[model samples]
Target chain A: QYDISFADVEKAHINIRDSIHLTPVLTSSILNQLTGRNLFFKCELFQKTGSFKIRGALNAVRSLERKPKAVVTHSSGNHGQALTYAAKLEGIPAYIVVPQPDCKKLAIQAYGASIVYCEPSDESRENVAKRVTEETEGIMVHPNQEPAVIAGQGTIALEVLNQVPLVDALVVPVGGGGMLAGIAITVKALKPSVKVYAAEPSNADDCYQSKLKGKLMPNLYPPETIADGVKSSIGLNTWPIIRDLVDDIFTVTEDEIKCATQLVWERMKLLIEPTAGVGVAAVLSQHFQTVSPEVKNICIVLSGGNVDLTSSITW
Target chain B: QYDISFADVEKAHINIRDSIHLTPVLTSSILNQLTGRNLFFKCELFQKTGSFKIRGALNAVRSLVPDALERKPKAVVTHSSGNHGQALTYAAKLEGIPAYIVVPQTAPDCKKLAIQAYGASIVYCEPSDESRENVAKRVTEETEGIMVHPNQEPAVIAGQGTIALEVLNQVPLVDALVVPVGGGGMLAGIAITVKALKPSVKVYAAEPSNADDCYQSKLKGKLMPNLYPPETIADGVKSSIGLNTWPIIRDLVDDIFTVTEDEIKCATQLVWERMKLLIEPTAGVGVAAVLSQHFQTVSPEVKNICIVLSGGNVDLTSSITW
Candidate 1:
């Protein structure tokens, strides 16, 4: 019972097809040995601006009216940068209000966007982007909140379904649940047999808690965890979509995400950064693979691969 | 005039195409600003066995008669374990001959090929000047076959020249040619033939500032004094440009530019990150020289200048980035 129709999100695919990397589907002879099952990787790390965020970023800008020349948004990491990159692609300037230190996110600004730094808290972020929104008259493009954005982000699975074998389960990382919802809608429409799962951080596991109690997840902030990947509350578009489409959900501890990221790097020669911890953590934690024997071919979207990883000296 | 006709060598191209890698001819944006020329790099390093030597190795080995495979000469030994001998070992193994590699006195263990581990004879010599030539004589006396002298030999030159043939065919019409001048066979072969074909075209040789033997020798107009062992990170071109390579290089090469050490490292890093190609220091020397000139799209040969590359090393392995 998906709330959003797959037919409605197809427009996102059309809008983002040109902007996104349409990253190649790679098969690892090495990964097959670790899991004893066939697995394929969608190396979205090679995406334009280096992640799948550009798809959502461009779709949000393309759907906007009056074409705001500059946009105000708050991001702690890649989403802020993705929006900046997407805006640059359309000649739309961006004024980003981020809570993180300027030293940490200069790469995004240097790539052609302006920035406004605020106090390191959600309250300050909302107040700051609101001020910038009023001052520059810029629209706020939420990293994962908007409907068109998640729908556009969902096309990642449309590509996976088009490339690899008929996977029995699709695993993805979740923060606010937009990507999780987008994937579920696409899978339910095309491959109804395949199960859609989301992996969130354990201590900060709002989505996992919500899936258990069957209710909206209250916001969790100031997380004592490294995985900033799934750290937001479900949005308006995300909540209804997650309630209907997500088949199974799980959460992993902080240490699990670290070792899992390391495992993918050592075994697969992939430099998966912390942001890609969700799906990877899900698989390693045996959350989805331990599912009923009916689950055969599993494809995990290794959402991003750019990381400051220790390259193993052992060749 | 060059001895080999450009038309005849196109046949050798067809012969060697299969095992070799047709590496991408990448474009650089920042380089375009400095040199005021549009440049294209012919990634010959991506060639099979990682260097242009395979062309010669195959041409050399394939030319062996059916009877030659039977006699199975005692072994094949070249002066160095660089790309030439390594490429020969691969070809010899494919053609079924025991190979004995005679490495110069001081090459690194990382640069050593799997051939030695695969049980080929490893005849390591002293760092003394006469050691390789003396052992080479002993191997020649014992085994009784040709030494495919890295640069002096003719077949090797012809085979290395085929890179230019591929460049002209792929990105036809370039105004200039920039290639690393190590022993000079690669530069002599490609630039000599490339210029003879289009005498008006400029052909420049890029030399490492650490081992600027070519830059020093080309100006003297005669065979320069020996720099017994070349001292540089480019383990490939430690020996001075031999007399055989000197003549061909002196007459054919138009200009010679030496690249600095810092420039070498940066160019090496560029290939590793942006292009995703792993090239070592010697290969880095050629790229650094051209890009340092600030030419992006080297606009000769039609906004594309095809460069013959420095190749054939496992130099990207071990502590280095591969």
Candidate 2:
């Protein structure tokens, strides 16, 4: 059983206090008028390495009882970048196994992490990660299924509550569900009044479908979605916590996600990735067209902002 | 005969303390390495109404004595590129007064919409000082309102000085300060504050090469207005420097840096794309000043650099050249 108490999240926050940036909670009147509800953006997109994954990566590496011989992870984006970034900060070697021809490879390498290429599949990724861990005599920190990583992700909730004590609802974009599970645990434990929602792309709605089927769903068969960071589903460690604590799951289409990102760009002047758009999309979705009037504030955790400049917005 | 005092800037700070946002001084490690100096960005783009103009607009609006308020001048009027229009409108809207803006016809749509959103009536004029001022005067006379020249006003200059006051406090030992030159209000305000606070800090004014009135004015020993049919991308700085700002700029400012069209575009894109901070081309001129070759040619010391990013009202989706 994966057990991560609220106290562990508090401890993780303390350990990583000086390590990561306590990103600001920003607001936009334009966004408020658009959503018809007051919105507070927990701007994790501005975090170091351009994502919230750094918090988990740094905390997990520091939470290690002894120095890790080396750290290894299989990621296509923010997690791999964060691991290498955090490892570099801690002065530890980081090995990353990623599928070739992926966009984030260069960024990972930029962090001074050695990366190995593998065929794009769940089996290839795991086998490559396993072999990497075995050969380097290092530990494999699963991006989603790791307890320390989940606890690290929970610190966002801890900070959100601390920043906006009257936050009525907490929204997070769900990819692998680690951050959602972590956030749900912290928010529920600290402020049971706050509702937690996991936002996902409707096309790659594995987590949404899993809650429907009442069990964990495989994300290997994910839909071809542009939200590259969230083309994943719930992991074993994250599923129980998600099912028990999360209040609801919301699904948004690729169009809705893109629109949400563009709005932030136009109105707030924040550059955010499509994965981060899922939360804003949920806020704008018909599912919750009008949030409860009593809910004065809704906090959306912007997951990341790393994007290749070669691509331009069609709109 | 400019007689604005540093104590007046302190008073302006108090007047607009609750009215305007005290934006954070942001820094980027990547930017630092690229510039080869510790760079501090006073992010005024994040201020309310998405520009630093609110400070002056609020202070000027607040500075109106009881007699002026009792007269209830039908409305306040100004001719601006965009920022001052939005600021005056927003400030007027807050004080339950109306604002009429006489602006260039070619002003960016984003600023136009922002002015409209703030409930200000607008009059379009040709992109010339004569046309803009004539239209503003007509509106003021018609409505029985007072004229508030965007840059020539003493209150606005005092309000702009508060920004440098904050920067000096935030980064005490800053070696140089770079700011974009518009009607020269912002730069003159900053120059006065910097000279008064730390006489050692070099104050540099950034102007677009095509609209090189400020730089040329210094060489000619007088204000030479040469922006006929202005062609600069930085819309905010096309007008000639005002009479009130000329003496202050001539005295306090170390030099004026002129950046080309390409530099402004490149700098704006770099700040938005890499630093993740959206800014207008006017702000870009100040950035290009510190990042360009003119930086080394202008100042020997580069210990700490603070550049003021003035406004961010440009529409990014359509404006990005890429």
Assess candidate 1 and give its TM-score to the true structure.
0.69
Cα error, residue B112 of model 2, in Å, equals 7.6
- Residue B274, model 2, lDDT: 64
Q: Quote the TM-score that chain A achieves in each candidate.
A: 0.89, 0.92
Q: Would you estimate the TM-scores of all the predictions?
A: 0.69, 0.86
lDDT of 1 by residue, B65-115 (tens): 323455434456676566777788776677676677776657777546555
Candidate 1, position A47, lDDT: 71
Q: Against the unseen true structure, what C-alpha lDDT does each candidate score?
A: 0.69, 0.83
Considering every candidate listed, which one attains the maximal lDDT? 2
Which candidate has the highest DockQ of all?
Answer: 2
Per-residue CA lDDT of candidate 2, range A188-229, in tens?
899998999999998888888888888888676756887888
Alpha carbon deviation, residue A64, candidate 1 (Å): 2.9
Task: List, residue by residue over A3-83, the lDDT tens digit for candidate 1.
Answer: 456875698888879767677665554556666666676767657655677787788888874867677676646677788
